């Protein structure tokens, strides 16, 4: 006669025989902040390690911060053997992964790249990447998930983003497909990518209503729909009703 | 004319359909031709609305009075409308 | 934990509550043949955005599907059916397919993990666990029964293995609530073998002879071994360590809690698979967590 | 409310087009859009600007105006957002619930054709400056301005 289930954010619903529905709310705020404010690429290894360590120390994760600093010293340096710490780095990655902290393991894998990629097998790396991506998507952190996918050291995880994400656009006047890298119609010889607001060629981002088949610059359409409910091109369509 | 058009567009001139006659106020300046045109358009819109409540009017006086037959001119101007066509 | 009550307004006892994938939505099924979907707003209050009659008999379990397949709900009931409900946009929920293969009551229904596609497993009271599949995720009105497994015991709970690793074969555990005087294992674990393309009984937990009311695989989330939580007269946690045909596991019990002092009805892991909540006949929710020495301890007692 | 013969006259439509060109020259784009709405309401013969439309990869028919994320013609899955990996779609048929919010509209870079939800890619390009799809070096937002 009882029901029980945690939610994502630590809240817990518990319905039992009197039946009374109670949500025992609290958790993972550290995970959200950590995922949001690491930098995984675009800077040298030392800078990335110091930034991540500063994040971990600010959030109160002293062990994570010292791990980042230790990685910086180990990698970004009558000397120690070149592969002296590889076993220890692998053990640290496995230690963080086996306790549910897949975020730290994936971040270290991405930051280090090939320095540790060849030492961890592909299957475990893919498992960590997928677990971290699922955690990020649960918290609705799409930007961090896509950054991880783009910077993923595994080819299979990288290919997860290129599946059915290409749009085939056609000219309305000619009803024929357009070139894959174009902004002018092949047949009609008309700038079919004209913004409905500014009447300028939309070379980059194009937002398109599915009702009236009209659109334009993403910012321009956003502003117009913020200021009105009609189609900017003027087809009597309430594209975003109310 | 370009600056006047800019100012009128900034003031939403001619876009008011609640009562069209106010558009000449939105024109900024006192233009007799604009005022006459907008008052005529308002009158014809009012006639269309009244007819709908209880096409040809938009054709203008020339087309309206073309079918006006059967009127007798008054020889004497007595000094004292419904008798008209 | 801070407790807050919800005005369920359910005509009978609430049998199951299941959050969605994102944690922002809820689905509660009761014995009044009604399933209610709750969506919370920025104010934090849970609003019942949908309430429709589903089945003829009491509805036992309601489970969510991954959002990539859309807002999809599967509910099993006493009328030997497991219906699949989809949301179409107001908030209208439509029945897609009624799964009528089971000849007896379907105790539990659970969606398979995302990496398998859209697969559904239903366990019936006659000992048959049926695993379905939708070949086309855009056509939820067509479900094809892939496998059916005879568990030789009255099934009461199932739990997929949420591991997304390619090193772990598909695995479904089946618990039984049968109370026969004879002492036989009440939990059977079946692993899908790619070579045979058929589910085969991999491991059997002989130590569990009491009736089982709920089983729950722990979210793998980067681990290498599988952790299973079992609800019985006590709370047991088993760790399944694969060794280097069905895979052989070094089954070790790592927890056995009688703090409920009564029958434990439900067990539910959290997102990280680190804290386990158990709800027993005492009406208390006991959160169990393991320290770095693998000594599972109670981190809180929660009362209605 | 002129008769369709007057609205079909070359001179009237030429004056309308010249006024719209003047409005574009002054960058009165929103006011030009308001005038376009007014003209479409009053003159049904004013065909709206013909812009691009998305076509199903398999059927090839237009997906413009029953799963929302499926092509209306061949019931095939629609292209998915490069960020949330959820198949894109928009239900088709005031102070009411927005049946089709802006943050769910189809949105793609016109150069690399990689697409996603409007809100998702808006946030992504607010944060980053590269195409979300892996192995694509296009700078989608930098192309426009
Ligand atoms: Zn064309
Ligand atoms: Zn524009
Ligand atoms: Zn339009
Ligand atoms: Zn539209
Ligand atoms: Zn199609
Ligand atoms: Zn998206
Ligand atoms: Zn691209
Ligand atoms: Zn691009």
Residue numbers in the entry:
A (entry chain M): 340 to 357, 395 to 402, 408 to 458, 626 to 790
B (entry chain L): 390 to 443, 450 to 475, 483 to 487
C (entry chain Q): 2 to 90, 100 to 254, 262 to 321
D (entry chain L): 682 to 746, 770 to 797, 812 to 863
According to the publication:
Mechanistic target of rapamycin complex 1 (mTORC1) is a nutrient-responsive master regulator of metabolism. Under low nutrients, including arginine, the GTPase-activating protein complex GATOR1 promotes GTP hydrolysis on RagA/B, inactivating mTORC1. GATOR1 is regulated by the cage-like GATOR2 complex and cytosolic amino acid sensors. Instead, a series of dedicated amino acid sensors that include CASTOR1, sestrin2 (SESN2) and SAMTOR relay information about amino acids into the pathway through the intermediation of the GATOR1–GATOR2–KICSTOR complexes.
To understand how the arginine sensor CASTOR1 binds to GATOR2 to disinhibit GATOR1 under low cytosolic arginine, we determined the cryo-electron microscopy structure of human GATOR2 bound to CASTOR1 in the absence of arginine. The purified GATOR2 and CASTOR1apo were combined and the cryo-electron microscopy (cryo-EM) structure of GATOR2 bound to CASTOR1apo was determined to an overall resolution of 3.89 Å. In the GATOR2-bound structure, a single CASTOR1apo homodimer binds across one face of the GATOR2 cage, engaging one MIOS β-propeller domain per CASTOR1apo monomer. The two MIOS subunits straddling the ‘front’ face of GATOR2 engage the CASTOR1 homodimer, while the other two back-facing MIOS β-propellers that do not engage CASTOR1 are disordered and are not seen in the final density map and reconstruction. Specifically, upon interaction with CASTOR1, the front-face MIOS β-propeller pair breaks the internal interface, pushing 10 Å apart and rotating by 16° relative to the MIOS α-solenoid domains of the inner core of the GATOR2 cage In the GATOR2 unbound conformation, the MIOS interface responsible for interaction with CASTOR1 is exposed and not buried in the β-propeller interface. Compared to GATOR2apo, this movement in the front-face MIOS α-solenoid and CTD domains results in the disordering of residues 757–836 and 890–921 in WDR59 and residues 727–746 and 770–783 in MIOS. Two MIOS loops are responsible for most of the contacts with CASTOR1apo. The MIOS loops contacts are centered on the basic residues H112, H136 and R137, with K135 at the edge of the contact region. These four basic residues engage with a complementary electronegative pocket on the surface of CASTOR1apo centered on D121 and also containing Y118, Q119 and Y236. In CASTOR1apo, the MIOS-releasing loop is disordered, which exposes the negatively charged MIOS-binding interface residues Y118, Q119, D121 and Y236. In the CASTOR1Arg structure, residues 90–94 in the MIOS-releasing loop are ordered, cover the MIOS-binding interface and sterically block the MIOS–CASTOR1 interaction.
